[PDB]
Amino acid sequence: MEHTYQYSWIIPFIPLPVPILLGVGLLLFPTATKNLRRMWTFLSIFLLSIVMIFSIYLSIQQIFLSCIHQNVWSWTINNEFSFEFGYFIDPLTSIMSILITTVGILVLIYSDNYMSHDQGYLRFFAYMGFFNTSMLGLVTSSNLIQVYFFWELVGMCSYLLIGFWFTRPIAANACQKAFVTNRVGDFGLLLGILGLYWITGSFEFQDLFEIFNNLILNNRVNLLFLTLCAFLLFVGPIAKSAQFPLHVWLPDAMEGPTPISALIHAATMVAAGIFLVARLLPLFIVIPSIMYIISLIGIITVLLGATLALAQKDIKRGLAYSTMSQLGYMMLALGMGSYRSALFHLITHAYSKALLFLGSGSIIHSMEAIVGYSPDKSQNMILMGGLTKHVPITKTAFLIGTLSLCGIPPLACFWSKDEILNDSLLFSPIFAIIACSTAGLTAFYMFRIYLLTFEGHLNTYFLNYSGKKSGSFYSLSLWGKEEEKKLTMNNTKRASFFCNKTYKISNNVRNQIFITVENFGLNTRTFYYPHESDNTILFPMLILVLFTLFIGAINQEGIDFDEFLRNATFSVSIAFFGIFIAYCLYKPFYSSLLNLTLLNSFQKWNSKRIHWEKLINFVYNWSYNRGYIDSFFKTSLIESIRRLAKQTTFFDKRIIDGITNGVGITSFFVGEVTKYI
Amino acid sequence: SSVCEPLPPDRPLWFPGSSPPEWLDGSLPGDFGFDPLGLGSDPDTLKWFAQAELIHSRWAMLAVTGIIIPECLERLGFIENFSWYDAGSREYFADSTTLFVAQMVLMGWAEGRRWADLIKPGSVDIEPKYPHKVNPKPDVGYPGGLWFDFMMWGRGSPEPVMVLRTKEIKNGRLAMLAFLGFCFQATYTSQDPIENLMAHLADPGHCNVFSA
Amino acid sequence: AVMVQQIEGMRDIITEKHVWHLSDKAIKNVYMFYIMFTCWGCLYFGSAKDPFYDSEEYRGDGGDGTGYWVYETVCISPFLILLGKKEKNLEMH
Amino acid sequence: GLSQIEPDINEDPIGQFETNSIEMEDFKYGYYDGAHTYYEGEVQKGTFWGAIADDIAAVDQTNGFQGLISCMFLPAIALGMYFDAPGEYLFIGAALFTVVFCIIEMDKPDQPHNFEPQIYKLERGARDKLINDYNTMSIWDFNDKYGDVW
Amino acid sequence: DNGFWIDGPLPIPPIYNNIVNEKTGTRTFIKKGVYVADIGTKGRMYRVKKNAFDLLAMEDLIGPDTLNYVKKYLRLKSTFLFYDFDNLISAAASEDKQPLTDLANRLFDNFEKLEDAAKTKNLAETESCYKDTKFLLQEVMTRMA
């Protein structure tokens, strides 16, 4: 305590110098620093390991000693600013610091091989290290000034990571939409911290906590100003944690890397909003209506995040909407006032879905050998099919992750969601059974994802489907030296060479002579099956498996750090109901464990597809059109600004530049007239 | 890409202008021909001595780290009363004799697996198999593996494998000598290594070994 | 520098408050060295092999250094080919 | 560009806001964005000092003396503080540095990229301002094409 | 006085019959325009503690060629202390009123002498006044805590 918090200012700045050296290396001497290709990787990993060990040491001192350190320095001293940039060590700082550092180290170990076949390598690790710098500075922040500072820097790093692969234009639309949405949240954080400075005059996390115990009891401040100030202060976490108004940036983040899917969300950056709301809960329990607003936004986005992940063709977008629905669970917990269970659910999701993203990217890099390089091919969860037979450790890691979200008590994570629903049902009956219903839906789509990825035949090398596969397996025909010397140019064999005559019909033969000329055999015959990725992909997945097994059982440390059977079996029953409904739909007949009489009766009861033909249509159109909110925002929010921009440059160039140009036009005209008069 | 190419005959030697012995052609990393006595004559025993050097150097490197880094933390104000040559006499749990036998059990497992690697290379194989995936056969002392090469730096990713193994061996020979300096100058000065460094850097002339 | 803060809500706070400011003279000093860096960089990087504004891509086509050399080029070289076409018709092509 | 002939008008002005990039149907992934290029084994060493000096030697017009004074100029100010506090001596030294740099930058090569685009016709090497002081070769009037072939 | 943008003189807030001024003039560290918030009497009591700790932990700022930032930091934090003591004595309990306003007077004359010491760029008088102003800042913090 005596000498370890005075050097707590380094944990933002320790990742920083390798993006500083890359930002002056790639920008000045690109052959030199790209010749030092893998060394900056290990240097970023080592500096983040230093920050990991120091954050673990601060966490050990937080669980031993109950104290908070606020090691503030001075930044500007001219007038009423007197600004500080200090570092606020609460238990939330320890949770967020280990949550950044462990996930960042594992994503960097992953990204050594994810980017190992990328021409863009070092600028990705510059963005990674500068993002880790910015987010660790965000969580070690003693005032809203520095929260605002590193908040916008995190938004910039999100822009850079999503538009990392800058040559593809869908990532360009993605990163523009992402940074603009983060700036719509930044907007609210601005006029929210300025509203708090007008209500308090604080600009510090220290004095807000001892002013908001009696600020609402005053007559000068308005309750309306406090609730609109707190709502605008919540607009920021809406944009970071991808809540219902500002959610349209999250599923477009897929076009960048898969490590940024593991780090922009299921990690640090969507935990920025959770960190902010949980840090400001001593001034969110005081303002009465904002708690209901946070509960309302969470309970609106949990039905949106659930129904979106039901019918995604993309693996990464589906896990993104799963991340958004779990972030809605976190905001629903933050709307409970639950100071403890919200952060614990944050920890277990941020170690669970990070593992799920690394498993998804291992699936993707295994599929790259099959389909070549394409996100509509190598990220399409439909034609993944089954990979249990091929990549087993990826299967085990992805399965432990999806059971960590499905809520399995012994060997996965369930106690978090148990505390969520336990704190939910004694609060308001409207919010509770729909939360359990979304939990059942969450188990449903996560098991749907697991079955479409790992369980069944491959859907791409399947001999019913691929014609090049049937041409490649059968190097010789079924007769050997008969029926052909091989036959190419197989003609229009409608009659099947049976000399079949025709009754009264429209036509049998015509002037149409079209031969189905098929492709050949014995050429690129191999079609190498998706083998396992190297050690740098499995090793973060093994460590995150050890996390999600270790955190999933956490006389407890629930109070010193910061209906028992019926509710638990109800949550497990509705989750296993989602398991069962996904299992009977996607798990094929040759590998399912169910009795074939019941399995036959599933299609026998439902062979009509008329009362299913509207339900599947509505759910798929919802998940495909993004609840039509993407189309409405691209119709009347950004194209409305485009029409406003064209109208405003019309008013500029035509009828205020028109007046100024018309002064000279009139002087020319009166000069030409009075010359000739 | 991953072949462990040796050093050329016209390599830098420990003693320039001297003839390197015929049993140090350059197959091993850090081969500079150091053999005034010639203890590595028998190549079947020079393999064991190369493994000996490698493990000795790795332990010395971890040890010099565990001596100097925690002393830097003590100077920074993290650890109390740190002194590595009195850090075995000080108090823990388990009496330092139960710790010793538990250490001997666990390190017996580990070093026994390593011994079984040394006697017969493929006996204790790790990095489990995968369909249509051929894990490369490693060398003794450099197992590769998911546990010891998770960044895949051993097969020659950032740099060639020979220069990386030479980096390991040279950095580790330097660490072996650093630990000998620790074991000697912590008993002929009865003081701290970093303290001895700052004391010599104060006055390099008169604060040397001849003062004591 | 040690202040123990008593807030009833969460916990006690051990704020440090190292109030500091770069000395008045040091702001002049960092200005002095940055004007020195500006001087050095202007001289040295003006004395550099400037790879774009040397080649026949820039200096060859037009390249007077303005922003209209493209426009006077594509506005005068068609007049150049019209002049060459008239001088071609002057000898009956 | 050059456009000796008049260019084809874009019949499809793709959009006032969206880019001029190809769509996802024609975008080959990996080989366009570089995300799946860099198969190593074809790259070279020169690690971080065989490629800094390669780059400094690639773009430089400086001799031995000028350039040594340029490399020692900024440490002469970094030792202007932390070693002394001389005052005006740094500014007078940098002023004389710039004066002697400008006198050194009256170089003997004159490098016809330093000349007008009206100079570029042909045989401009036979033009020698590099040696001929007070040239008096009245060609810079630029109004009629002069044959300066003498 | 048309709601938005009161206009003309742009006044500073007055003193509610308190003897908290110099009496040969009002006060010489009055920053002209700062936003002290109408929080409440416990809020002003806490912000006295906060800015008194700020001027307490002004240690690492004081030094040669730094006296102007010392003067600006003093004027800022002491203007905060001035309006907060004005609200505290303006909402005092009629027996805590007189000793706390005498404490504020003997604190503010000390601030005047320290501001004049840092205004004339004299470091010895700055430190010789900063000693007992550190005493009085510890005194006012342990009063407000």
Ligand code: CLA
């Ligand atoms: C555990 C110790 C150890 C061992 C087993 C080896 C083993 C080897 N070294 Mg390495 N080496 C070491 C430590 C060690 N080295 C250290 C600390 C240095 C730096 C000083 C070097 C520097 C070095 C170079 C530069 C080269 C080698 C080479 C070799 C090979 C041939 C020599 C041989 O067989 O010696 C076997 C050695 C022993 C069995 C240990 C000696 C034990 C006896 C009892 C003497 C110990 C007392 C010692 C002199 C005390 C030091 C006093 C102090 C004042 C300095 C072999 C693989 C050559 C090679 O091909 O590299 C691969 C080569 O060119 N070594």
Ligand SMILES: CC(/C=C/C=C(C)/C=C/[C@@]12O[C@]1(C)C[C@@H](O)CC2(C)C)=C\C=C\C=C(C)\C=C\C=C(C)\C=C\[C@@]12O[C@]1(C)C[C@@H](O)CC2(C)C
């Ligand atoms: C393995 C090793 C060190 C291991 C250290 C460990 C585990 C340390 C543990 C601890 O410190 C910590 C971490 C923390 C403390 O709290 C506790 C202890 C327990 C104290 C050192 C080897 C140190 C090894 C040394 C010094 C070996 C030197 C060998 C030399 C010089 C050989 C020379 C020659 O053999 C050649 C090469 C060739 C021949 O031809 C010629 C000659 C000349 C014969």
